[PDB]
Curated annotation (Swiss-Prot):
Domain of life, per lineage: Eukaryota
Domain EGF-like: 2-38
Modified residues ((3R)-3-hydroxyaspartate): 19
Source organism of this protein record: Bos taurus (Bovine)
Disulfide bridge map: 6-17, 11-26, 28-37
Residues of the full protein shown: 85 to 126 of 492
Protein name: Factor X light chain
């Protein structure tokens, strides 16, 4: 039922992405910040 949770590019701007328990998890690289790393610290 829950094969891949990250096969749809959940994180933006090359965030860090690792599937886990369905809700997968998305971390931002040092530089981006936000739910999807949408905001940049520029």
């Amino acid at each position: 039922k829950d094969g891949d949770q990250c096969e749809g590019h959940p994180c933006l701007n090359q965030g860090h992405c690792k599937d886990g328990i369905g809700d997968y998890t998305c971390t931002c690289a040092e530089g981006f910040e936000g739910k999807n790393c949408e905001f940049s610290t520029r």
